[PDB]
Amino acid sequence: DNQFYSVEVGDSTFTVLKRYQNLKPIGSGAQGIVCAAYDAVLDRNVAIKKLSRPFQNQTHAKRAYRELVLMKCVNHKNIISLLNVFTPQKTLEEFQDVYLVMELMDANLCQVIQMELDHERMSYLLYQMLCGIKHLHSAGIIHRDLKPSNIVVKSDCTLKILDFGLASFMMTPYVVTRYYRAPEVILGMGYKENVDIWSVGCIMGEMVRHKILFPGRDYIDQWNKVIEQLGTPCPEFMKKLQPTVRNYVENRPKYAGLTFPKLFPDSLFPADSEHNKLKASQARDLLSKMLVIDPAKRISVDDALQHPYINVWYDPAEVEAPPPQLDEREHTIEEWKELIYKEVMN
């Protein structure tokens, strides 16, 4: 008569509540494996993520605690909803894993990118991406690490964001994606709201070109790709770089920089229609404003939402929603356990 049960999913063991049946591994990230499942109580499918020993290290603990907290207080339509949280362990001493049960989407953005999208769907997706980033910002949150994988969508094309970004040693087997990070992040410069716009621009560009814009083994290569395409940033920008960094970027082989109609030609945009020819120019325009190295010259979230390519989905009921301690600390794996544990069970 145990409230839980166990099943082997892939390699790890998922121990979940009885209400959740027929588990199917729908994915795997860095902080856990995610299975889809049916919730006999709510009569619907859901996604369950297992946080195995989230307190094993500050990187994982900080991430877990933070996500657990913000996912319970924040409430938006474009930010994955938290249905239920639980732990098969009965006490703080036995405590080991944390199961996050959420609503089940249909696919990853990485999958959507691998396909041609009409201006209607491409713009609607970008609108939701910005609609949410809008809320996250109003909630005092600035992602700074948005990427295709952390964004999920349904078939009806509705879009939702999974995590809340950063706030860092990781002795693990798998890498981290840096392709969609902003220059101020790649070079460390201090950021602001529009630091996420850079990520959105990296995605929109990939939704079109169908290939990762600025790929790279290290930030060395990544920054190279940034200039090889956009060109070397104006001298007004370099005087904001750390003297040690400035000395590195300035003394780097220059570039004139390709124009946008070059980077994103019409071959990538479906402009067989008089209506498509227009939207294609508009899309190419929002891109030329989002993919701007200089933060001071980059388009804000609010402007990108007033852009003719996006505004065609506006609605004061969606974007305009009411926003809600200081979870940016430093403890030990035994404290983090206590913190996370008590957070799990209110």
Ligand X SMILES: CN(c1nccc(-c2cnc3ccccn23)n1)C1CCCCC1
28 is in an annotated binding site: yes
Nearer to ligand X, 104 or 263 (CB): 104
Give yes or no: 145 in active site: yes
49 is in an annotated binding site: yes
26 is in an annotated binding site: yes
- For residue 179, what are its two tokens? 């392709």
> DSSP string covering 135-170, please?
HHHHTT-------GGGEEE-TT--EEE---------
Q: Which residue is nearest to ligand X (CB)?
A: 27
CB 164 → ligand X: shortest distance, Å?
12
Nearer to ligand X, 287 or 344 (CB): 344
Nearer to ligand X, 35 or 141 (CB): 35
- For residue 113, what are its two tokens? 């990118």
Would you tell me which residues interact with ligand X (CB under 6 A)?
26-27, 29, 34, 47, 49, 102, 104-105, 107-108, 149, 152, 162
CB 185 → ligand X: shortest distance, Å?
21
165 is in an annotated binding site: no
231 is in an annotated binding site: no
CA distance 315 to 292: 27
10 is in an annotated binding site: no
CB 108 → ligand X: shortest distance, Å?
4
Spatial neighbors of 205 by CB under 8 A, at least 6 apart, are 213, 263, 264, 287, 291
Nearer to ligand X, 56 or 224 (CB): 56
CA distances from 75 to 69, 81, 97, 136, 342 (A): 12, 7, 25, 10, 22
Q: How far is CA 69 from the centre of its chain?
A: 17
**Helix (H) and strand (E) counts in the chain:** 12, 10
CB 223 → ligand X: shortest distance, Å?
26
CB 31 → ligand X: shortest distance, Å?
7
DSSP assigned state of 187: T
Q: What are phi and psi of 97, to 5 degrees?
A: -125, 165
33 is in an annotated binding site: yes
Query: Edge-to-edge strand order for the sheet containing 20-28?
Result: 20-28, 33-39, 44-52, 97-103, 82-86
Shortest CA distance to 85 belongs to which of 53, 59, 50? 50
Q: What are phi and psi of 107, to 5 degrees?
A: -160, 175
CB 144 → ligand X: shortest distance, Å?
18
CA distance 332 to 346: 21
> Which of the residues 145, 196, 285, 302 is marked catalytic?
145
Active site residues: 145
Name the binding residues for ATP: 26-34, 49
